[model samples]
Target chain A: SEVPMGVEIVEAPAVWRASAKGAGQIIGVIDTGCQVDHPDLAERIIGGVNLTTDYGGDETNFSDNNGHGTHVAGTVAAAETGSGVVGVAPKADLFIIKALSGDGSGEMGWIAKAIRYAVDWRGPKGEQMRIITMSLGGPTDSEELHDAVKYAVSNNVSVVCAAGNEGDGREDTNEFAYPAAYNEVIAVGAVDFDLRLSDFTNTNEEIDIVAPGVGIKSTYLDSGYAELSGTAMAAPHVAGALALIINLAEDAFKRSLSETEIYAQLVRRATPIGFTAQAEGNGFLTLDLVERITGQFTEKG
Target chain B: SEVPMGVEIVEAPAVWRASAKGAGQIIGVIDTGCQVDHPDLAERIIGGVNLTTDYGGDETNFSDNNGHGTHVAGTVAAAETGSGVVGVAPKADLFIIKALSGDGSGEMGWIAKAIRYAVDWRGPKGEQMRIITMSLGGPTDSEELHDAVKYAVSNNVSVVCAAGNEGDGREDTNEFAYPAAYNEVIAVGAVDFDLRLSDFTNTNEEIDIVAPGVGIKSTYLDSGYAELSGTAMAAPHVAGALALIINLAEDAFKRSLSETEIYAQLVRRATPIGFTAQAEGNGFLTLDLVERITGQFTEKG
Candidate 1:
């Protein structure tokens, strides 16, 4: 029953009320590698490929040397193993793209390739990576990278991105993060457990939603858990929430939902936290939308 | 209100009780081209490409020149129009693979390529063809085709194939058909409205299920309806049933059901009909299994 404070703040437990914990839904995590054997993350990872050249371009290995990917992955899908922590969608699966190295850095080519790869990677069970989330960001955007994001969205893949941790904490000021700033993605901003916007979260007009990023407890490297803080942590919550929304909505609707429909639902259910439009595009998603969904299904029946 | 008699015989309406008419589920069909604008099938076809050189290798045209493909496509997913007929899963989408020619013939390379194409096909919405059904079969099973079937199953794609109409109407006799004889696919046999095995349906140990094929009413060439008989018609029923089962099961389970699990459910619900094992592998599917599936989901919850 021990869930992270951020998980609670995001109201993931409410979405899990109807037993929809993103079961069998796969999310592609494009970042630094993951702690493949982390206690909370081992079973959640379905498949992963290393695209970084740090290890002589070995596709076989995708173990996390950097702690960032593991932390982000934990926030998105740490299983309910009864010990460490449970994430937003504990039953969801993960596919790691080790595009970034231990330095937590990758080129535009790697990032673009990672996004395309996420859109194409099919699992052993013929399952797809429905959403691709990137915790890493850059101050400058690349046409090559934007093209990749365009490809993803056009193909009905939800692209979740982090609005970098370089904010002045002023609503009047703005910070731009590539891919996040692009119209194709759902850019995430950081908020504290008290629902206060984190000072380090980028204040950008492109911020689609805010999530709990301060004092985020998640899986770390070396098979451990740690408390971290950043907008990077905020992105994963949105990514996991997409899985949650899809699982619940598809279950009730008895149909596969398009990316546009899912995004609309996410926006509709998001709660306004009295922030500027730039600070909170829709707002922070905190309430469960499944009841409304099931209501429609019942009426249709 | 004018649903086809074969649709009724297969007990498809019962499975539609939960509003699971395969909404948004994309099924890949490999055969001669499709009637792109057939009243019963136009809206149901999301996208398709020509894999054969019949129209000078035109990649754009997947229009059916032969009436066979149109008939199969309609039976698998003809929409519920105010007039004409409805398919087993009316709301399901279709992706056509026009690998066969006007003479109902294709080379091993074309068939193999078609199988692989179906396995790897992705829709514009980033959706996959969950199940691929082939109404065509060859007397000689090619290594190339078997390899493609293997690739599909290994990747969790359900390959529904026809058992062929080469039977001599003898219980002690057996007939083999390419890809259909392969254990990796669900080989379908034909039956009449009386649930008696069709005299023409191939009698083999590989036949997984039997369905109505004799006097089967479906959409045809020249924007018309016709009565056709073959295991081809039988295979579409089973193929469309998978869509119905997947829609209902995934909705209740709040997850994607693996091919193995779906096939298991299909086999479990099949009625033996007092037929020999060679004539009917698990017998024919006519009962609604949604209740049993929902029961398991309830218990798990």
Candidate 2:
């Protein structure tokens, strides 16, 4: 599939053989809103919710001050043990919503009130989020952030935003950008390392998919780890593979499948985009075809 | 590296070998909506907005009595010409905000006035909006849908919301769900394909990612194609990959990017999640590491 651009090591035991990594799941990195301290992203920076008017700065909470939300919370879940840089659900569970500062920018009403305090943030002990990374977006449109992204998917919560890199040649094909061009957020676009489409990525039709923006490595400043580029690092690698496919489909049906059966096992495992639908989509992300449609079989339970 | 489920068709293609896909963007599937005359999702239904209180369901302007907004707009963008299935921004530009009727559900102030009319739902002649999908949510958290997802990211627009299959389990962690739990919407949850974690999905910490919710599939009602699951179909595959990476970086980046540079080119091009700190955070959705972090190459002239 013509990959390149520093590829490899994206395996991580092939994501626990596609059925066990996001142990419990939580995901939520609004932006410039995490880092309680950051040893390697502070034990996964659990407590976040600032909506940013102005904080200590750096990375918001994780402390990057635009190191870019600690390189997008180390690419959306970074942990694996402090050496740093490793996300996509490194054990999942987070909720940092600083609302962009440290540099990633902020104030679309504090990033829409940090999206609504991260979809309504709870977790003082009563958690239940599944995804809510904002990366902070802006342009002009707003039905109040489209009713906070249709009330975070009618209460399922999946609002990953970022598509604003602008596009190359730079003119203004009508310039769409806000909470990541808003179709309810998940706009993400930008492709380099040869996938092409990334002169300033912000493509049209609202860009639904296409990760790895460009020059991207992840986690910078202090906590260490760099590379960086855009689409806000391709929306925390789809929010750490949606928290490691909901912890490998609840460890193979030991009993736990739902958010609509893990959003239909991650879009029935998207993969096709051979390029030029205007610019690929549903062609990437293959955590082993989403653990064979929902792994740990046993007749699924 | 493990992987097995569905035998890994993860296909990355490194951002189209270095950047090319992401054609024109403009996604806006606003939820509990869109049928738009489904002849295979009717040429990807490029314009709509019902916010239904009643009447307005013909020529396929979305006629689902509860099919779930044309299955969350056929998992965001549905195209591939073949019809039947294929989305995640099939070339982006979809717009269908029927709001809620056909029974899928509604109210939260008509989803905060359909998020201010889908961030100002313009198109079919005017053309505006970059992303807005919202498989409808609830829990009544509304501050006005939290100020309409912070006013649709201050204008640029990027909403996407879900995360609320309602399992509570994890000892009732951060339980909230309403506008996808609420924080400005991007809550999404639900995972199966064995990456574990699902138990009705609803942890806490604001959750920012996770997709493929088991049995998935899309476009419902008489014009069939089912498998219906949740996170409202993983919040329209991140709103059809932000309408295919904003249709290839908003027309070669002439001057569009500013929703915080499209949220810094999508979490700076997500993909990391080594796993641990909490479970994981950012790893999957590997569009070859998000097209290798694509962004404005720094031009403009």
Candidate 3:
């Protein structure tokens, strides 16, 4: 049905657009470096850390060595440029930390340091940073990284990670990813347009939220956007929405909500996916519902 | 010294470049409308509530009728562009609520409402919005607003407000602005570069921190930047720092820092101003001390 396999679709949260454009909120991309000069994403790339000393590159965030970070960034807070491609939180800022290099692989030490650095890093003038997004993971978990995740959450830094692409059912518990397996982080699974778990998407207790990950379109190299697959795509939707929600929460609540509140809101507010039930979380990223949470009403006059 | 008039020239805290940028964090701006489209300030604005109906503007953070919010945004997070000016936490996100208008006049209902809302918003989508900045003030302390401030803090949102600009030490023994007088919020006073109380700055038992408010340069209207003077200007620096420190703390501690922790850091790391050795907080905004408290090391070889 020529829906064009993996076409990028705009699933922006309504509440976000009605309010501030990310208001320039930061979302850490703990993956391969992103193309810092991409016209659509350049302004948002604040800076990041390169945990891998191999490159001797001190810059944390740059162009994606692998095309993953840019795609992930697009989903989280890609600006509402007239181009059909949209980000969950269009006005969000980016902190591209290159833990993984051009190849989609990074060591525990590199990821761990990136998390620690993200958790504790301050802005140009000491403003508090918010969430950190990690799109890479293996079936193995790490105590060191777990400690770092716990530390980030304890400090009010929400952590969002992909729930791995091992498409398995709950009864069949396959290898889980680090940090994501850890309870503190918001582990995300993937979904399709019809709201069914993609055959490649993993299902387990670690799966917290579901978003359009199957055949999703996003940014790529050479000034071209691409359609990609995997939980890697789904995770950033949550990350981008988190940036908008966090930004809205700051205005509505005068403070950021606790981890418990944030987690609950994501799942509770989601729409149910094809008979998937609560197991896969409420549903997809609906902009309408998000608007209500922000309590931002348009001017009637 | 090429320093502006009566400027003592104390160095503000040097940002921790190695520390994570404030990617997904949010802070509140309770003030006049914020220019959401301002080049340096737009990206950081998450969402905000406009309690005033006089102008019939969007209650949400859609636009800033005047440039005050934009100015304040610059001080808190004006971005790292070498252009006009940079905020204390240029990398942080902004949750700007316009309680006032271009005229700079507003009612208590909006202030209270703004506070209540800022503490109520939430985002699990990798966004952890926090911190509220009130650069506006009135001599009268409204009980309604005071109660609202308490509610905000209880909800885990940190509030930063400006201490008035009545420099006569005699005018204040305990004389502070309303919300600033509220214990739940952090009351920031203004100081010149010399770390001396600005002639127009306020002083009182409620003063929690001192920031640069004299001839401070920030984003201005008509596509240019300007230097303004007032406790209002100083307020956002503290707010930006609070946002930065809070974000840094969240990543460092594995848990987001409490409102108390942010205030503690502000007080603990401030450079002492000589107005009233005891009156002025720990002094200037010194990252060296803050990093020490947060265990951040500068020289990474």
Candidate 4:
């Protein structure tokens, strides 16, 4: 009878009410891969690639054996329907890139390549992927991953990433997991239903925003729905937000927005809460603000 | 000798270098009480009252028996010296109100009265206490405490409180202690040396910002310095920053700033790291931007 709390919390309903459900956008989900056949996600999974060579490095191998990618995918583009959870941009198309293995982890090389692949990828309808969401991370700062993020952003692909979950909060430590820590990417942390910071969420200078990552109900592997938590869940929220932002901006302007413009608009709309930029980045990613801002721009201009 | 990492982390040196060392400000230390006799703090103890009636309410009873208050006080206004460590606002005077007992606990009603007293008290030079820093908290959301915070803010006093050390990162919960959770108060959380969220710091929507709270070295009881941790140590960093901000703004404008104006400036200058507003609030309390913003205004105007 209701959408997931995260979808509602980000005010995606307002966006939906505005009829900006990301109808023409494609979000790249770079993780363990997504369950391509999940009922709520089937129509949204338009295309993808598999870089995790363990499965033959083909499109079929992109199907999620691990649940993380599927969960992330659901948060970004799952459809609204009877007995199904909704995503932030439910109508947005998904380009699943299986860079990680079924164990829910992957090498940085694979991730970097997948990022480049997403940026260069072209859909069957000649549509370009505009948003890339990564939910996996490692402590080792990889120049390869950093460069790939820069490459994606340079090619006009908006990148969003998890701000890691290695936080023990023990000492003043720089535990930025790449490629989220890269300046070019939009780094996200986890917040719960009560909008409290998740204890496991990492902190650093790269964090750009936060989203619902605690106990998020979303689509999972084996064609089922599951509750998940982590900065992983948070990244997709922003990716989905980027889609909605793009959709709204394009609809309002009667044309598509450049990647820089989309990213700038997203940052500008982020509502700062009671947390620091290190923790909350710009603040929570809510659709109402984007809708409000885009509406304001349209009305005035 | 290097500056205390807390001071450097908050970038107070930049403010001090600009000669904005909170020279004419009075901050209220509402906690277990300060070690007024400590060599580093003796000169800055301007005026205060003891509200903890259980231990006999008198100025003599206000000296800190518990080490927490002295540590917090030192972080707020302990003076710079040839050998001893420095605080965020080394030259700021303090109103030492003993609100908590030696055991690091206090009744909400007593704390409420102490907050009201701090707002009403003036210094020897008739300087008003524009900032109140509390490094104490409880699970009970006391209406009396909330009202007192509102009253202080209404009277142009900036109230800062510890966000509590209840965060275990086990679950997303609202553990923001009373006074800190009040709408008018600045709820502070703990971050480590790497600007990471403290595992023990509470996370909630009320959290306004974070500071160096983990393994913080500051002045303690018995005229010595010790390492302490908690959202307790973090609150005073912001309080001290507030002092510096007030000093710089007043000195620049040639007049006093309203508490609202000071709070806004503090927020505007906070450098956000990788945390959410629910955890870090406006971001880590730093004076560099305050120095920068105030300088810009002063130079251009």
Candidate 5:
């Protein structure tokens, strides 16, 4: 009746019936478009727009062609339908910002255009996007990309991206990905369900947090579901958790939380599980910190 | 501060401070992409989707590659910023549905998909699409299109399209256009500022209303303005007027207006200039019919 185990791992269900199910929070996923018809995602995926030329100019169908975006979307906001997989914040809305194509790749400028699109997306009833998650990235960085991310951050839009799955399996070996390596984004790393670092998940100072990335189960293409392994899978957990945190944190604070303030709340709630700063920036994210989130907001300072 | 000559011809300014400048109403323009950066349209151009292969698959830039959609959009909702040109419903929003391409041609299937897209498009804050206008059409009637128009009408969305320019300049002849000729749509024809039916405007039983068309000055390419001819110019004026009507009509009735009710309101107010029923269906549309609209809704019947 609530969320799946992947979501439960972060204790997101603890706040579900508490009216913190990420209602009205929109997550902008800049990747391949989603399989909007999937049972768990259909209701949550309110709408999307095509930025990739992969569809031959069919902007109406943002349904996933590559299947990767669908998987990523499920982990972020798949509905908590009892029949299929459920996402972290199951009640949250999704903005399927398609920047990549079927080949699982796109030009730097296309993704940049998606970043601006995500930030500029307006809702009819005061719905605003506070968090953006990109499960795709590369090693080569471009000025256009860095600037787009900066613009997002400047507009109080929190940008989160996967810290590429090119890990050397050693904390000392840094495998940098463009958007993840950028100073502004929340670079997400990965860890197995047992809390062991995945050898393939990139390790770098830019790495913001680690989550259950290996064999992570989520909704997928063909009206089905699947499990995947990568830093890509891990980032959405943080994305969905951030969605839950936004509503709860804002409710606790009684005002709008700045992009930085929301980011700090994300960092503040992480539970360190014995990992290097580069391996896991803050720690494994958990929602047992919900009480402290409320207390932290009422700070005497 | 209210509007231009073509707009004044309909007397749209009669309901501006009446809080009916189409503030929250969205007009979907299914033509060439718009010049999103145009001076007058920049503000009211809320967002759009591309269903045409015109822009090589770039869905983010709905900027008009062909000048027709931009000019048509200007007639609908160009901002009243005391700048270059103001639209009919100057404060209304534009949902630029780019179904037609840069060459002003597209497969019939593309336009069909756009009809569904505009109806299903969900805005964050309970925003909805009430009116959709297409200034382009072919002589061949297709089943896929007829159904799309039906779907829109069934869903309370008013469909408006130009009654093609194949008139043969004779009242005795009929030049049927698809969708517009399909009976369910509000088929708009052209009239000069002098209230004479444009000779080129088609004559058909489906003709709903006539508006200023010949040498109609509106927004255009290069961030400039141009005066264009055809029923294409006339349809947008009605499209913008509907935006003003939806808000005011619903208020006067204290309830939601159905597609039929809204269509009646448009037809209820048009001042017929002595012409054949085929050339001027209900007659010239004028906002002087606003009071009667309130009176009609307060019918003691």
Candidate 6:
């Protein structure tokens, strides 16, 4: 079973059909936390860290109550076998980081620390995280948060974040939200089914690309599916794209692709649409072209 | 003798230096009408029509009671002499169309008819208008207005419009102010001196490009100059660009270019900056490259 429309829009089936299922890649999702026991996402949660402990008693508990994190995680790596809501990289591993509280808000420093943890964490088998994704943001431009993103990129980790949902419909150019505005991360905006820029996605200079955000059905808090909309949902699509591309590039190059190489290729592959460059970023992410390039298999080490 | 900051922003002087001074071109300015007798704009306003008659007694009177139209007109064709506030296309002719009233408001049908009137009006030598620039807009999406824009485009007229100044710094995708939302017109957004999207410019799918809009110095209704900010101010920059492009294109090809070719070339010449496609459109409108391409003089007629 699959969320056929989402996959169809980004042309992920072409890459999926080519066996670019992101088997060995792990994406770190930092937000309120994830519903780790959810059927579609349970097996994919390899590990996580809980930083919201100071606000409440369960410091070690990293389960989602606000549902935003679960929704984002599902978009990244929810298993294809459950509830007909498949993720972009269904086979990829997830490293959850609960930086925000159950109330769906947190300070900037927590997110910054979560990013550092993700960049430094390693699996039991010496597997390091390949990508870091954050859908939570605010107006506070934290120097620490930006430095953390820089650290992730320096550590060969691809970081993606939501462009924020505070566009009050005024014609003002908005300030970039937190770490997403940082040059080290890919700031994603939101688009609807018709590929029009979503109404709530912030328009700023930092936007790198846009993805489907309106009425997106995905895994939610109670191990059930729900439709959600925001730049938050859009961020995970890019994170998932990073996962698939990592595998595709590794297979094509016959070796590990550096974060710089993967990001460069990702930006180059974005197809420009009708929106202004300031609103759509490079363009929407398309996996069909990613597979097409990988299938040629000519990039040498 | 020059508004160096604004001129430098859209690269207007670059085209001026290349001799695309818009000497023979005419831009139909659809607004509240101009301060027709202003010394800086008097020579530029060759002819005009008055659609705002019901509010007052004289149907032929298109003078500005509100300063908006005069300000916009100054941005489009104000001369280098007097007031030291030169427009983007100083030598370009203007056809003032008073659609909005003194209070800066109008009905949909009036705006629509004004557009058609602009499309139909001609010079003494039977030369038709090549560019139509509208700075007034609202939330209402009128079918007649859209049709009028379509008619203008089909008739080889290039239409430029304001993206709107309703952005409230919230994350809501503001609907584009029509008839700018209509695809036939180039929906222009606003930017500040730093090239950032203005705090008041609408962020939406219809945004085609952006221009200098914040703290703009232009002609006022009292035959004086005033500083204004809005997408309204941004629209005239593209209108001026269209004026210059028309002349450069004509000179390069040794004949006039069809509106389709000019629009296509305008979209092609937009240089992408650090913004998303939805916000920056093709990119900010630049006459520097327009001149560079038009100066090469090798395109087939």
- Candidate with the greatest lDDT versus the true structure: 1
Give model 3's docking category. Answer: incorrect
Judging by lDDT, tell me the better candidate of 2 and 6.
6
Q: List candidate 5 segments past 4 Å from native.
A: A1-301, B290-301
Q: Which stretches of candidate 3 lie over 4 Å from their true place?
A: A1-13, A54-61, A169-175, A274-279, A290-299, B1-301
- On residues A1-301, what C-alpha lDDT tens digit does candidate 2 reach at each position? 1112322223334765454556566887777654456555667667666655565443333333566776777677666663645666666767676666666666557666666666676776677676877655677785777777777766767777767776663323435677666654556665665556667766655555666667877667665667878777776776677677667655543345434445444543444344432243333444564333223435545
Q: Write the per-residue lDDT of candidate 1 for residues B1-301, one digit (tens) a residue.
A: 6689888867889878664688878899899989898988999998887889998989989888889999999889999878788988899999999999999998888889888888787766678888898998899977868999989987878899999999888966889898899877899998898877789989876667788889888998999998988999999999899888777656543445556546755664465576665787656766463243223233434
| Full-model lDDT for every candidate | 0.81, 0.58, 0.66, 0.78, 0.81, 0.78
**What tens-digit string does per-residue lDDT give for candidate 3 at A116-223?**
888788788775567888877877766878888888887878899887776665524444677777766877777787766676666555445677787777767765
Which runs in model 6 stand beyond 4 Å of their true positions?
A1-301, B54-57, B170-172, B290-301
Candidates in order, TM-scores: namely 0.50, 0.26, 0.48, 0.51, 0.49, 0.50
Docking category of candidate 4: incorrect
Q: Write one digit per residue (lDDT tens) for candidate 6, span B18-117.
A: 4457788889999988888998899999988888864464668888878899999988988888465888899899998999888789888888898899
Task: List TM-score (chain A only) for every prediction.
Answer: 0.94, 0.32, 0.87, 0.92, 0.94, 0.92
User: Model 4, A1-301: lDDT tens per residue?
Assistant: 4489898878877877454688888888999888888998999998788888757766567888788899999899889878578888888899889988988778879988999998888867789888898998888886767788878887878889999988854323446888887766889988898877788888766677889899989997788889988999989888888888777655543445456446645764466566555677657776675334223233545
Model 1 gets an lDDT of 0.81
- At residue B298, give the lDDT of candidate 5: 37
Weakest ten-residue segment in model 2 chain A by summed lDDT: A1-10
Worst 10 residues of 4 chain B by lDDT: B290-299
Q: Please, what are the lDDT tens digits per residue for candidate 5 over residues A1-301?
A: 4355667777877877653688878999988898888888888887898988776877766778888999999888887666777888788999998888988898898889889988888878867788899998887988979999999988989898998888877887878987998867888898887888889988776666778888877887898878888988989999988888778756544446566456656764576676665787657787755353223243466
Clashing pairs in 1: B33-B64, B34-B64
**Residues B1-301 of candidate 5: C-alpha lDDT, one tens digit per residue:** 4356998878877777664688888889999979999878888888898877665777666777789999999999888777767887888889898988888888899899999999988887869888999998788888979999989988989999998888877865878887889777889999898887789999876677888889988888999888899999999989988988888756544456567457756765576676665777656778655353223233456
Report the lDDT tens digits of candidate 4 across residue range B1-301: 4368888878888877544588878889988887888888888888667888646656557878688889988888888666477888888889888878888788888888888888877656678888998988888886767888889987988899899898876325656677787767888888898976778888776666788988888888889889988888888999998878777655443445555446655765566674555666656776675334223233545
Worst 10 residues of 2 chain B by lDDT: B1-10
Between candidates 1 and 4, which one is better according to TM-score? 4
